[PDB]
Amino acid sequence: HMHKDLHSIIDALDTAGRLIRVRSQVKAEHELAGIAAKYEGCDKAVLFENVDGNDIPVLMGLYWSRDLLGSLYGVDAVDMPRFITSKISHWKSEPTAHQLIAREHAPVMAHSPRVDLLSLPIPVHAQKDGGAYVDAGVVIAADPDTGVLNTSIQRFMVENENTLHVNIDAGRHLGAYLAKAKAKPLSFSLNIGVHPGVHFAAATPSEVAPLDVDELGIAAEFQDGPVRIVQGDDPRVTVLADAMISLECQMYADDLADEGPFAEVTGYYAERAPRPRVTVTAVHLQRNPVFHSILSGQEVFNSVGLLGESALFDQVSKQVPGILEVALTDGGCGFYHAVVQLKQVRAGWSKQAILATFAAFPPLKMVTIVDEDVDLRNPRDVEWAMATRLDPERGILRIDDTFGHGLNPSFPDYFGSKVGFDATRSFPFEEKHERITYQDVDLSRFEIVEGH
Amino acid sequence: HMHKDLHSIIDALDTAGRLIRVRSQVKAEHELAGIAAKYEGCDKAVLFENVDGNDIPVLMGLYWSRDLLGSLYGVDAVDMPRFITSKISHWKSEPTAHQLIAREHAPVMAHSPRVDLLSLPIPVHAQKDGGAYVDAGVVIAADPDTGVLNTSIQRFMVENENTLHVNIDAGRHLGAYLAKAKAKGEPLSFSLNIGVHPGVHFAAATPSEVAPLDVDELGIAAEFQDGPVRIVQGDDPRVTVLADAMISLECQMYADDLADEGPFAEVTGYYAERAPRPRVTVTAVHLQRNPVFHSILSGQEVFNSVGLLGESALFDQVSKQVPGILEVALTDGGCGFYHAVVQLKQVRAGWSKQAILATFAAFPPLKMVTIVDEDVDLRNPRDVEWAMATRLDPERGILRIDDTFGHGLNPSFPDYFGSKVGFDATRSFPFEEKHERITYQDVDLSRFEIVEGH
Numbered sequence: 001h002m003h004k005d006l007h008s009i010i011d012a013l014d015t016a017g018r019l020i021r022v023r024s025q026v027k028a029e030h031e032l033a034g035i036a037a038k039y040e041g042c043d044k045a046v047l048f049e050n051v052d053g054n055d056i057p058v059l060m061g062l063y064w065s066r067d068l069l070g071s072l073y074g075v076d077a078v079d080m081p082r083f084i085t086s087k088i089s090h091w092k093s094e095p096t097a098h099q100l101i102a103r104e105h106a107p108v109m110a111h112s113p114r115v116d117l118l119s120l121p122i123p124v125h126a127q128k129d130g131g132a133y134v135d136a137g138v139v140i141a142a143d144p145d146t147g148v149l150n151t152s153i154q155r156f157m158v159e160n161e162n163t164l165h166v167n168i169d170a171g172r173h174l175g176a177y178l179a180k181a182k183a184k185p186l187s188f189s190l191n192i193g194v195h196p197g198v199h200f201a202a203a204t205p206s207e208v209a210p211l212d213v214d215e216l217g218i219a220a221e222f223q224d225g226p227v228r229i230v231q232g233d234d235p236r237v238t239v240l241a242d243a244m245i246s247l248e249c250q251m252y253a254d255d256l257a258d259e260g261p262f263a264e265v266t267g268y269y270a271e272r273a274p275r276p277r278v279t280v281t282a283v284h285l286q287r288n289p290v291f292h293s294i295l296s297g298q299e300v301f302n303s304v305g306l307l308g309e310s311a312l313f314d315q316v317s318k319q320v321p322g323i324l325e326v327a328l329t330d331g332g333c334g335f336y337h338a339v340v341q342l343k344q345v346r347a348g349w350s351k352q353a354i355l356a357t358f359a360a361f362p363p364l365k366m367v368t369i370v371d372e373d374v375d376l377r378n379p380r381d382v383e384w385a386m387a388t389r390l391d392p393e394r395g396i397l398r399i400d401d402t403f404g405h406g407l408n409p410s411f412p413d414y415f416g417s418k419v420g421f422d423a424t425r426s427f428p429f430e431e432k433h434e435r436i437t438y439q440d441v442d443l444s445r446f447e448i449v450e451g452h
Numbered sequence: 453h454m455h456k457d458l459h460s461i462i463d464a465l466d467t468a469g470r471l472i473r474v475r476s477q478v479k480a481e482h483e484l485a486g487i488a489a490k491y492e493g494c495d496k497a498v499l500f501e502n503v504d505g506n507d508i509p510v511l512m513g514l515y516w517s518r519d520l521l522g523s524l525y526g527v528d529a530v531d532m533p534r535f536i537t538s539k540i541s542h543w544k545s546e547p548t549a550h551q552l553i554a555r556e557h558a559p560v561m562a563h564s565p566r567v568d569l570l571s572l573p574i575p576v577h578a579q580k581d582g583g584a585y586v587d588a589g590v591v592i593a594a595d596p597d598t599g600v601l602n603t604s605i606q607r608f609m610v611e612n613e614n615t616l617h618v619n620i621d622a623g624r625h626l627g628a629y630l631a632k633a634k635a636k637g638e639p640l641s642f643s644l645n646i647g648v649h650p651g652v653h654f655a656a657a658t659p660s661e662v663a664p665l666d667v668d669e670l671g672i673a674a675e676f677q678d679g680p681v682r683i684v685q686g687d688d689p690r691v692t693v694l695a696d697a698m699i700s701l702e703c704q705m706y707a708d709d710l711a712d713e714g715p716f717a718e719v720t721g722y723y724a725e726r727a728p729r730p731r732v733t734v735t736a737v738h739l740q741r742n743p744v745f746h747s748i749l750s751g752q753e754v755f756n757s758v759g760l761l762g763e764s765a766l767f768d769q770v771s772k773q774v775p776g777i778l779e780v781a782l783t784d785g786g787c788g789f790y791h792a793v794v795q796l797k798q799v800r801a802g803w804s805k806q807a808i809l810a811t812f813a814a815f816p817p818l819k820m821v822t823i824v825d826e827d828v829d830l831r832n833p834r835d836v837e838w839a840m841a842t843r844l845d846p847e848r849g850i851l852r853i854d855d856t857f858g859h860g861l862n863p864s865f866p867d868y869f870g871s872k873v874g875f876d877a878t879r880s881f882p883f884e885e886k887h888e889r890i891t892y893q894d895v896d897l898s899r900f901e902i903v904e905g906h
């Protein structure tokens with residue numbers, strides 16, 4: 001239950017019967033995403049064997065099911081956030097140095113075609129996206145002053161066969177490396193089709209891996225041995241050796257061009273706007289490459305939740321007794337709604353739980369508290385707790401004129417109202433709140449023919 | 453700037469002119485506390501050279517001025533909470549093992565009179581206190597199962613020459629050790645060590661979440677002295693005595709053996725209910741030569757014990773969740789427990805409200821939180837009143853939390869349940885001229901000849 005590269009992942013899923021093979025030709029324009037969308041969240045990923053008759057198939061839906069990611073590493077969905085955090089803890093304490101290897105030993109260097117981005121089966125995802133996007137690509141970039149690596153993930157729109165437009169949010173480390181090159185232009189690699197270890201490294205936030213620190217070793221914790229890197233053609237750049245595809249890239253500061261729209265976590269479009277142009281100097285491919293794309297939605301909600309929930313749980317359980325679990329729900333875009341599950345020990349702690357949760361995660365708009373006997377990850381069950389347990393008069397806590405996330409239109413200019421729901425039963429516990437229960441039953445113990 | 457025992461402290465204060473010597477005879481009944489009360493909070497402690505013509509003087513007022521405690525360790529008042537926290541951090545990381553020493557080497561074992569508590573100049577403090585109290589005594593008690601030490605501070609009322617009645621709050625570690633003695637058929641032995649240096653006081657006052665039940669917090673004291681904490685076998689011998697104490701009482705207490713104690717002052721400023729609470733019997737008494745009896749006046753002495761230990765953790769927790777936090781005060785007006793003022797440098801609208809959430813979440817006893825800017829003195833209630841008068845928006849700046857957990861001693865929170873309220877007394881952001889405070893030139897008074905009254 002360790003994985004060197006995406007091949008390992010796909011074979012494991014194929015073997016486990018968690019792969020949906022779409023054998024028919026599909027169009028990269030809208031149709032592909034449309035099919036993915038009908039499968040979003042189920043316990044399987046989707047391999048498209050034939051995209052506009054490309055030789056390169058595309059994989060989508062790797063991240064939309066915690067059960068699936070858990071199956072790849074032998075952990076239950078519920079234990080995955082702790083699993084990932086424990087591994088990032090081990091990396092902080094004893095990092096694994098990368099392994100630099102010779103160009104002709106690096107599977108990704110198998111081929112180097114003339115740079116033609118339009119030959120790649122890059123999907124146009126949502127119906128109003130400003131073009132085809134690579135959105136599962138991990139950027140590796142060296143500090144122009146200190147050569148220290150930074151690993152981030154960023155959306156790149158294809159303009160033409162050799163140009164991408166990239167979105168770099170404010171205070172991103174890639175942004176800061178560009179500021180340094182602009183005291184001299186910035187080279188880097190874009191590594192598409194990487195294993196979850198690289199993905200989690202890329203997505204690890206600033207306060208876990210500072211600017212002056214190399215987060216890429218996080219990936220080493222999800223594979224035997226160290227992360228394999230290789231000198232690019234550049235040579236100011238470093239390439240991920242076990243990537244399916246890798247693009248050597250260069251970008252000048254103060255050189256902007258219209259990119260977007262694209263889906264944001266909110267489920268709304270980004271504003272099309274002048275953002276940095278990046279020019280693709282070279283292209284490397286394994287033989288038998290699969291192109292890896294992410295469907296905006298649960299794939300992104302789980303990336304954020306799996307990395308963020310353990311810290312949040314740690315911060316709340318430290319300030320409040322009886323905390324069991326914290327969910328950054330998919331309904332809340334893995335960012336705007338937290339459900340906190342606790343075992344009450346005294347009246348009043350449920351309200352402290354609301355304060356602690358809002359204090360620990362500034363983007364949150366809603367917090368809901370529920371008891372140990374409600375499934376915090378089932379929105380039906382939280383709705384039920386709201387319907388039978390919430391006192392609307394004393395259990396709704398509203399915070400005005402506070403800081404929040406500017407992308408969410410409930411928070412214009414990072415400012416608005418937050419609301420907590422205390423959907424706990426009354427304490428001390430009373431019979432009128434004891435839920436009915438059906439005997440738990442192993443279905444494998446019976447012969448059951450289900451449809452035919 | 454290290455201190456082995458209380459002698460070191462008193463000499464340092466005497467040398468520094470931070471000692472008030474009351475040379476006249478005073479009565480331990482009410483009069484002594486009455487005099488202390490007139491001096492509460494000033495930059496000096498009070499040594500009573502003559503209490504009912506006892507040979508033993510009493511020291512009071514060691515903890516009521518952060519400036520004074522700072523002077524003892526060479527730190528400014530403002531840096532004292534961090535000073536203490538850093539030292540407790542070093543102890544958590546690399547504890548110093550205690551040094552056991554021979555009875556005739558232990559200064560406290562100099563004398564062992566027959567047990568007469570009424571021969572000690574133990575003050576009756578507040579006018580309705582149910583008797584004389586020792587309230588600066590640090591209890592050292594060994595786990596009856598595992599022998600692991602626990603250091604706590606607890607009020608003991610004198611009943612007669614050989615009996616005390618003690619108050620043990622719910623979930624105290626001494627409470628848990630007493631459960632073990634009774635669950636094991638023996639009662640609980642321990643020592644009561646009076647006249648200890650601040651390092652022992654801070655060990656005693658260190659809460660459960662810093663030093664769990666299964667952990668020996670007494671090494672914290674080693675961080676405020678050269679070398680390790682000196683202990684010594686008592687006469688018991690289930691007990692361990694602090695060698696450098698001024699006075700130490702070997703004590704035994706049986707579970708389910710209650711007797712009326714109280715009233716006594718609580719941090720709230722109100723009396724505890726007189727009620728059946730555990731009787732403890734004083735088996736033996738040890739004294740240094742030249743012993744001074746150490747008492748605490750309820751009030752600022754207690755507010756500062758709690759604030760000095762609690763503020764750095766609270767600041768750490770809030771500055772981690774909110775940008776631009778500068779300082780947090782557990783104010784004396786709020787009994788060092790119920791009001792926190794948070795000072796910040798605003799960087800964007802809305803963070804002041806998150807500061808309220810973070811502060812209430814980090815310190816459950818709190819009833820009020822007030823936020824103010826860098827240009828308001830968070831420790832001056834006049835200045836925070838001013839921020840309230842000119843900056844608070846009463847409509848949008850008052851945040852009320854209902855039906856939440858709080859501290860049961862505070863009568864705003866019957867049964868550890870009630871309403872909390874936060875005041876956002878910050879200026880508007882972005883900063884505007886209409887909120888720029890006037891300023892007078894800073895001026896050295898020593899640069900001028902000034903005759904101030906005759």
Ligand SMILES: Cc1cc2c3c(c1C)C(C)(C)CC=[N+]3c1c([nH]c(=O)[nH]c1=O)N2C[C@H](O)[C@H](O)[C@H](O)COP(=O)(O)O
Pocket residue numbers: 134135136150151152153154155167168169170171172173174202203204205206294296299300303304
């Ligand atoms: C999981 C994830 C994270 C995206 C992301 C997406 C996903 C799926 C997409 C591909 C669906 C949409 C685009 N994304 C962007 C993004 N950050 C950014 O500045 N611009 C982006 O366009 N991020 C987050 C970014 O990579 C993280 O904040 C890293 O922690 C940044 O690394 P750093 O801390 O070293 O700056």
Ligand SMILES: Cc1cc2c3c(c1C)C(C)(C)CC=[N+]3c1c([nH]c(=O)[nH]c1=O)N2C[C@H](O)[C@H](O)[C@H](O)COP(=O)(O)O
Pocket residue numbers: 586587588602603604605606607619620621622623624625626656657658659660748750753754757758
């Ligand atoms: C600073 C301080 C703390 C008092 C205290 C006082 C002071 C000055 C007095 C002397 C003014 C009034 C009495 N006090 C009592 C008390 N705890 C308790 O259970 N009963 C008390 O009577 N405490 C608190 C107690 O000592 C601390 O909570 C310790 O951290 C307990 O240690 P533990 O966690 O090891 O049990």
Ligand SMILES: [Mn+2]
Pocket residue numbers: 150151173205206209210211213215
């Ligand atoms: Mn980084």
Ligand SMILES: [Mn+2]
Pocket residue numbers: 602603625659660663664665667669
């Ligand atoms: Mn303890």
Ligand code: NA
Pocket residue numbers: 151152201202203204205209215
């Ligand atoms: Na990162």
Ligand code: NA
Pocket residue numbers: 603604655656657658659663669
């Ligand atoms: Na203690």
